[PDB]
Design a binder for this molecule. Structure first.
Ligand code: MN
Ligand code: MN
Lengths: 176, 178
């Protein structure tokens, strides 16, 4: 299965509707530029993310992450690059709910549900549940992953410079 | 007149309602912590701002600025501090509309309406109108001010580290720290 132009358009339209439902104004030019990634894994609705970048420069970045129901962001970390410390980010759930996993003691009875054969590539299990208004901050170079709840989620990212191409994923099949 | 605890509570409640109308979730703990400033000028509803800080650290900052109808943020700039370049910020109008003024050729027929006797302390007049979804970025140490439209405005800030206490205002009557 492959990320086609038709799948991308469908995903953009779904994400645009979710943003509208959450009352988040988006320009026509931004609507066209929403990034759709299946992380190269060919199952967008299982592993994938729809991203609106508000601003990204050498000094700060802000994005809106849209997630369809139970969409999963595969495990990654944002490493130092040259003398750049690496991206630190704060997430704020805006709508729906998200299950975020970071290093720490495994939480019993985690909310996330991962395909059995992909569990090997999820290694952190300390759970943070974020509902609308709630936040959490990930230091640079820290492993993390997240899955939206059964209605999906919109999660804001506020961070230092983003360099998506340099992110390191646990799953060696991922191409960002 | 001075900013009392009752005036602060009233302003917080109004700003909370405006956030709810814009569907922006805020926690009970954030409701108590919204900053209300009249910039020390004693006319909150003319000059003033209601601020929710989402995050502010050495590496980045994000805030929600709530503005009542025609509330004005007095002219200031975010200067370098030591070796810190100074705050760069991007504004994004979320709701309502805002009239932002930056250095440049004065725009004829500006939308803003400033009290006659305070005009002397507004020195930049190049107009940027932001409606919901629209953004503008102010480089560090750049003079700027803004006024909300007749329905008010909610404006997001995304920026490098914020150090409000170091901001320099054109109006010498302003005290940022209440
Ligand atoms: Mn991340
Ligand atoms: Mn400013």
């Amino acid at each position: 299965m492959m990320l086609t132009k038709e799948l991308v358009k469908e995903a953009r339209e779904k994400a645009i509707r979710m943003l509208e439902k959450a009352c988040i104004a988006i320009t026509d030019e931004e609507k066209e530029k929403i990034e759709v990634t299946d992380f190269g894994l060919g199952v967008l609705y299982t592993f994938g993310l729809e991203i609106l970048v508000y601003v990204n420069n050498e000094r700060y970045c802000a994005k809106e992450l849209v997630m369809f129901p139970r969409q999963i962001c595969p495990e990654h970390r944002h490493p130092p690059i040259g003398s750049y410390l690496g991206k630190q980010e704060t997430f704020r759930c805006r709508w729906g709910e998200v299950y975020l996993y970071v290093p720490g003691t495994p939480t019993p009875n985690p909310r996330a549900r991962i395909p059995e054969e992909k569990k090997r590539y999820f290694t952190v299990w300390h759970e943070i549940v974020l509902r609308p208004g709630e936040q959490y901050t990930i230091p640079p170079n820290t492993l993390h992953w997240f899955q939206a709840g059964d209605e999906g989620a919109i999660v804001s990212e506020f961070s230092s410079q983003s360099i998506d191409e340099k992110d390191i994923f646990t799953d060696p099949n991922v191409k960002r």
